[PDB]
């Protein structure tokens, strides 16, 4: 569908082809996070630290519960029906997340039957029996620091010193917590927050959380690094200071007739100057339909592109004509920096601007020369079995295109300028010219 | 001032209205930060670590003092008068910050009278009596690690091991400090740097700093997360290695006749295709004057927008006409992704593209159909008391606009393409057409 031979002559060399995959069909699990450590074994060294801490934490946690109660108070069994008048204003994502919250409340009640057991945990990771067949895990923040550092040194330092260390530790924990769980969290109903961000309530240790939950797949790290594993807050307890989180663990679905093609840019010669083409480097093809893709939000591996949603974006007719053969519609920009690439290798064949860089044939010891009419040279083993470019010595294969590559020219496109202030300058000048003509 | 009924028909549904607030009138307090721990109680386990550390820290701190001395040497009481010839080149903000530094020098001298008391602190947080009525606080980096970990284990491990641990801890502290206090800090005279960034000299525990200073208010977390609490370096001591910081703590002022209005985007149907409107989502109105706002720099809460400065930016006449009723001037873009929203809820009334998504009436069991001439449907309880959209079942209120909403059409605008490379392509094609006409 793309015209690779014509594109290689304006410095756009064919790269790697990759598959397209998107997350779907999540599996759900629940877990408890308690945001206050147990100080029973050092109760005589606390002073007034815990009361002040609890006042601060209550101030933090109250608005989240307030936001959850709006959807919890206005949803009931008929499927389930929401009351639109009470809700007032919402997006589709918020409404679907509210449905999910209502679905989770049943297991929330079953877990909340064990409140006194939750309050007594004294380790970082504890297992409890929700039912004879079902279990629930509890993770407690700062418990490892209490159990391993402060308790073993009780008599070696004085009580005031222990109290001051505990105060400092709690304040540092709050300093790390406030970016994620503070006023920035104005909409907790959704289910798009990543598990890495949620794990800040447990010191940022998401690996332990996922290991305890028991997830195990071959695509685990790919799902982690594409931001595809999310969690949703389902319940907040303000007298025991804990939260319940539901974790969504999806699979990856491959789109059948789609792929992403990469292009490698190389400079070229025209009219005693150096130029580079202004064309996107990644192109999405779906059922012979060409579009752009916002690939900065996805994960790029050697074999596939992995995304948490569909990121296709539209493309103009002129650019589509550029990529299918009309090279006179492809814009270009002048080169003024020495860091732009000058050669590339594709399918064992070299494409090089032998005017900017010096090229030799190792086999015969002779120079490889490019005239002022050519843009760049294709070098393969019909003419040069082994080539020398600066430091590099490379052996080459055979080209699979036209035998007359280096004797046939191309039609060039119009220059452009992509600087941000230059855009405003060009728009202003064009408007002035348009007024002058009229 | 905005025409919401006309805008809802091109997929721009009315959202939440918010107040506008800006910081003002700061209250100032001084505090001391010492960047070297006291090793008196393990003096036989230090080796040559401290001398090397002091050489490195002196190298870091010398240019900051040099930058302060330029303003300190060229300012004197007449108000206060600066010497412009000596200064040479400066912005208005730098000059005002220099005035503030001169104002702070007096309390700097009063605090500097206690140098020997500063050098003797042996805790992380210490209070000292500057005057019979005024006190000053000292925070010491890494002192908690010294007091709680290294000192209590002196005989359990060998001297070399203690020395190596201390060396590693100091090197890690420098590794964290260098981004904020290194060569990136070329202008220390200003007072625009946040307290969170300043607290890297105390391990990033800004909560402890603010709690010791004694600030208290109901808008505390809102002020923190809007980056409105700043500090300024006033004095550097290179023989005792400490700095003096002045903290500015403001209040929030509400702008009287201003508000920020949000728009929720929904796709719509035209000519057997799906489209989305290219219009800003947040609009600022001040005394019936409409403008844009760079809201990415502000904090968005449920009831107000909180900013550390005035972020209003101008709007074109065409866009202003778009927002006041002329829908033929609002541009649009083609939809090629499946993730674009398809319905929304406003004041208990549903706006939905019932061509892309299946809509049903739960009350009567009958389908709700949209023709090819309509953009989207308004659904309320005069026609559908309860609606079903996929999973969601929702009960609805009554619309407050025209009774003939679904029988009256609108005038559409022109397509655009917002991709960055497409901008250059379109500009080039327009220039070529303009030349061709001439």
């Amino acid at each position, epitope marked *: 569908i793309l015209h690779y031979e014509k594109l290689s002559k304006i410095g756009l060399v064919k790269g790697v082809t990759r*598959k397209y995959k*998107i997350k779907s*069909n999540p*599996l*759900t699990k629940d877990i408890v996070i308690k945001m206050i450590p147990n100080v029973s074994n050092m109760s005589q060294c606390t002073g007034s630290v815990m009361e002040n801490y609890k006042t601060r934490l209550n101030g933090i946690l109250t608005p989240i519960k307030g936001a959850l109660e709006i959807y919890k108070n206005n949803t009931h069994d008929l499927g389930v029906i929401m009351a639109g008048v009470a809700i007032g204003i919402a997006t589709a994502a918020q409404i679907t997340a509210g449905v999910a919250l209502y*679905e989770a409340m049943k297991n929330a009640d079953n877990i909340n039957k064990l409140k006194s057991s939750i309050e007594s945990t004294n380790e970082a990771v504890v297992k409890l029996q929700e039912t004879a067949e079902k279990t629930v895990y509890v993770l407690t923040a700062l418990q490892d620091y209490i159990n391993t550092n402060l308790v073993p040194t009780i008599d070696k330092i004085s009580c005031k010193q222990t109290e001051l260390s505990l105060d400092l530790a709690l304040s540092k924990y709050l300093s790390d917590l406030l970016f994620v769980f503070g006023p920035n969290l104005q909409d907790p109903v959704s289910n798009s927050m990543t598990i890495q961000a949620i794990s800040q309530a447990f010191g940022g240790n998401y690996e332990t959380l996922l290991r305890t939950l028991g997830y195990a797949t071959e695509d685990f790290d790919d799902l982690l690094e594409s931001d595809s594993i999310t969690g949703q807050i389902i319940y907040v307890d303000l007298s025991s200071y804990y939260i319940i989180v539901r974790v969504y663990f999806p699979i990856l679905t*491959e789109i*059948q007739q789609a792929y992403i093609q990469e292009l490698l840019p190389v400079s070229f010669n025209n009219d005693n100057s150096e130029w580079i083409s202004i064309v996107p480097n990644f192109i999405l093809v779906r059922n012979t339909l060409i579009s752009n893709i916002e690939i900065g939000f996805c994960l790029i591996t050697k074999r596939s592109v992995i995304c948490n949603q569909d990121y296709a974006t539209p493309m103009t007719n002129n650019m589509r004509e550029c990529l299918t053969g009309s090279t006179e519609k492809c814009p270009r920009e002048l080169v003024v920096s020495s860091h732009v690439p000058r050669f590339a290798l594709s399918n064992g064949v070299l494409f090089a601007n032998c005017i900017s860089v010096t090229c030799q044939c190792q086999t015969t010891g002779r120079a490889i020369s490019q005239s002022g009419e050519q843009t760049l040279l294709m070098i393969d083993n019909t003419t040069c079995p082994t080539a020398v470019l600066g430091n590099v010595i490379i052996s080459l294969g055979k080209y699979l295109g036209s035998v007359n590559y280096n004797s046939e020219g191309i039609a060039i496109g119009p220059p452009v300028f992509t600087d941000k202030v230059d855009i405003s300058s060009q728009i202003s000048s064009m408007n002035q010219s348009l007024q002058q003509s009229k | 001032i905005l025409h919401y009924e006309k805008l809802s028909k091109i997929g721009l549904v009315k959202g939440v209205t918010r107040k506008y607030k800006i910081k003002s009138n700061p209250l100032t307090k001084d505090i001391v930060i010492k960047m070297i721990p006291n090793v008196s109680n393990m003096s036989q386990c230090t080796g040559s670590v401290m001398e090397n550390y002091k050489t490195r820290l002196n190298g870091i701190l010398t240019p900051i003092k040099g930058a302060l001395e330029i303003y300190k040497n060229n300012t004197h009481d007449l108000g206060v008068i600066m010497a412009g010839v000596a200064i040479g080149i400066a912005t208005a903000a730098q000059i005002t910050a220099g005035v503030a530094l001169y104002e702070a020098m007096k309390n700097a001298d009063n605090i500097n009278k206690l140098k020997s008391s500063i050098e003797s602190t042996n805790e992380a947080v210490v209070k000292l009596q500057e005057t019979a009525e005024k006190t000053v606080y000292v925070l010491t980096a890494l002192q908690d690690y010294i007091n709680t970990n290294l000192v209590p284990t002196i005989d359990k491990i060998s001297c070399k091991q203690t020395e190596l641990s201390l060396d590693l801890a100091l090197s890690k502290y420098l590794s964290d400090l260098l981004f904020v206090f290194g060569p990136n800090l070329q202008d220390p005279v200003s007072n625009s740097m946040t307290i969170q960034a300043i607290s890297q000299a105390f391990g990033g525990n800004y909560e402890t700093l603010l709690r010791t200073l004694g600030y208290a208010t109901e808008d505390f977390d809102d002020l923190l997360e809007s980056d409105s609490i700043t500090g300024q370096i006033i004095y550097v001591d290179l023989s005792s290695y400490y700095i003096i910081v002045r903290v500015y703590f403001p209040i929030l002022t509400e702008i009287q006749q201003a508000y920020i209005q949000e728009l929720l985007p929904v796709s719509f149907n035209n000519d057997n295709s799906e489209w989305i409107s290219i219009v800003p989502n947040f609009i600022l109105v001040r005394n019936t004057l409409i403008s844009n706002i760079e809201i990415g720099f502000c904090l968005i809460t449920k009831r107000s927008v909180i900013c550390n400065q005035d972020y209003a930016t101008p709007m074109t006449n065409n866009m202003r006409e778009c927002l006041t009723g002329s829908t033929e001037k609002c541009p649009r873009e083609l939809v090629v992704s499946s993730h674009v929203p398809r319905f929304a809820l406003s004041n208990g009334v549903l706006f939905a593209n019932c061509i892309s*998504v299946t809509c049903q009436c739960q009350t009567t069991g009958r389908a709700i159909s949209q023709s090819g001439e309509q953009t989207l449907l308004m659904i309320d309880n005069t026609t559908c008391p309860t609606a079903v959209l996929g*999973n969601v079942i929702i009960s609805l209120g009554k619309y407050l606009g025209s009774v003939n909403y679904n029988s009256e059409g609108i005038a559409i605008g022109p397509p655009v393409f917002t991709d960055k490379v497409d901008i250059s392509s379109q500009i080039s094609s327009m220039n070529q057409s303009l030349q061709q006409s001439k």
Partner: antibody
Amino acid sequence: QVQLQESGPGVVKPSETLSLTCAVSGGSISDSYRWSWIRQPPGKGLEWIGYIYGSSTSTNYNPSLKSRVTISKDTSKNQFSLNLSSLTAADTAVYYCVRVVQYLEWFVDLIEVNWFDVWGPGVLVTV
Amino acid sequence: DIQLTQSPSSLSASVGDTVTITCQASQGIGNNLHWYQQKPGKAPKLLIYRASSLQSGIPSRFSGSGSGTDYTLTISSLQPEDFAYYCQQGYSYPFTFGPGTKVDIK
């Protein structure tokens, strides 16, 4: 529509490799479908085994039988084969080569729906 | 894996009988649940796919509906020639079947 035929050795000794080739008529194996194998031991029900994509080289296998199994396809003869290793006492069954239909549902998020509609005659393997 | 249960487990009926059965899931599976038609000794077939859609060639007496973890199938006016039916999920790998109740001859 699509016609299918399973072929292979009727009787194989235990712990010997089993190759089963399903030949496809009434359509091209390069279709945008999934070609799967299903095992039905006599006296028992059905059990999915795995598949290979029609329009790509990707594969998927059941966790219980993953280590011993391999799947391949051939466009020239329009035939896809399964290889099973270390046949045992319970491996006596009837093998079906089937097409699996998939539908993609977009509603805020993505859900893929899979179900069985068309199978093959089936041949019995004796250990 | 996702586990499915069914209730009840007895279907002994003659011409002209009305029944309702339920299939429950270990967690929510959207509508990725299908009521199949298994044929003895050859290729099986299907009754209802996507939990509410009637397969072609099937009498219009059958109906299906459900949400979340609970789904139901309703049948009227039995013909006892047909043999086998089940509830099945295609939400998670591997695809699995429930216990089931099918047409039985007394």
